[PDB]
Amino acid sequence: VDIAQSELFRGDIQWRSFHLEASLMDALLNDRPEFVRLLISHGLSLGHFLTPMRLAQLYSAAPSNSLIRNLLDQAS
Amino acid sequence: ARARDKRESDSERLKRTSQKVDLALKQLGHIREYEQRLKVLER
Amino acid sequence: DPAAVYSLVTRTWGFRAPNLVVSVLGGSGGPVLQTWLQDLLRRGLVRAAQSTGAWIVTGGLHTGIGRHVGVAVRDHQMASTGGTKVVAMGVAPSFPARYRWRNYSAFFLVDDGTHGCLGGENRFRLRLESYISQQKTGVGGTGIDIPVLLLLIDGDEKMLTRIENATQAQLPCLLVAGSGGAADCLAETLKELLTVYSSEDGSEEFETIVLKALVKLDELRLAVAWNR
């Protein structure tokens, strides 16, 4: 996370919303709470971030042998 | 308040002191090398 | 009427009364601020406002000195302890709000009356200061008059006019050496209210410079007014 801090604290370099959203999705999928905290705290609009496809992908990221996945497929 | 209370615990103070002592050691090594180089150059 | 504005800000919005008021002005156009000035803003004005509960009154625009002030506030906050947040009022020309980010508690919108023009708000801003300097600090009328000081970095002819108007209103002003034109050039050229900020002076000594500018009412009452 130190590399991310150093990169995002630079004043000369500014990061557009696309990279922020991509990194946020990666961190949410890969279970890196510190990264999601850092990305959201840096002026990220979470309301526009979430899309139905993104939520579907997050729920699809459930483990194969998990109770959530079992119940989700049993509902279908 | 909870985070502040955690930060002011003795374990956190000791951890920060250890990190700062490490930083002081690094600076001391740098100063040692620079002083040796300056002495070599001035001689 | 500045009295109504101050009363609304303090009472109806829940903002605490300031023990110090510092106004940030000037700022030449450019995305890149000098590292020395950035350190002065980060560990100087912002730190003193944090440690004395001061009001940082500055331009709320996304560019200019206001952006630098916001960046300094964010830098202090990210490296801050569990202390009170600094109230940063931004004066620029329905409880829910909608806005696009692409750190200011208040956004004063002055009705200039003409779209596309800037500078009509300045007088109003000065009037507000002329009120808050005359108010009593602490509890009741026992407290001293609230100290209001202006800090100028960079600037132009309009900033010089603002400085002249502020010194007419008995508001002390400080000019930072090495900034560039306006304040720096005037300080190099160099009545009682005007104070010179030496380039040798930097962070960790801002409060003493503020005190020596204010006194030029005693030091002890100012110290007991703050929390130091």
Tokens of A39: 């990305």
Identify the residue whose tokens are 């009154």: C57
Give the H or E element holding residue C224: helix C219-225
User: Long-range contacts for C181-187 (Cβ within 8 Å, ≥24 apart)?
Assistant: C181/C28, C181/C154, C181/C155, C181/C156, C182/C26, C182/C152, C182/C154, C182/C155, C182/C156, C182/C157, C183/C26, C183/C152, C183/C153, C183/C154, C183/C155, C183/C159, C184/C154, C186/C160
Q: Which residues contact A70 (CB under 8 A, 6 or more apart)?
A: none
> Residue ranges of A for the binding site?
16, 43
Q: What is the DSSP letter of C190?
A: -
CB C65 within 8 A of CB C78: no
CB contact under 8 A, A43 and C71: no
Tell me the CB-side half-sphere exposure of residue C123, using CA atoms within 13 A: 4
Kindly identify which residue of chain A lies nearest to residue C68, measuring between CA atoms: A11
In angstroms, the CA B7 to CA A11 distance is 29
Q: Is C79 on the interface with B (CB under 8 A)?
A: no
DSSP notation for C117-185: --STTHHHHHHHHHHHTTSBPSSGGGSPBPPEEEEEES--HHHHHHHHHHHHTT--EEEETTS-STHHH
**Listed resolution, Å:** 3.2
CB contact under 8 A, C101 and A17: no
Interface probe, candidates C37, C38, C78, chain A, greatest A C-beta count within 10 A: C78
Q: Which technique?
A: cryo-EM
Selection from C152, C109, C149 nearest residue C129 by Cα? C149
Q: How far apart are the first and last CA of chain A?
A: 39
B4 min Cα distance to partner chain C (Å): 5
- What's the alpha-carbon Rg for chain A, to the nearest Å? 15
CB contact under 8 A, A11 and C32: yes
CB contact under 8 A, C32 and A12: yes
Q: Is B7 on the interface with C (CB under 8 A)?
A: yes
Domain definitions of chain A by residue range: 1-75
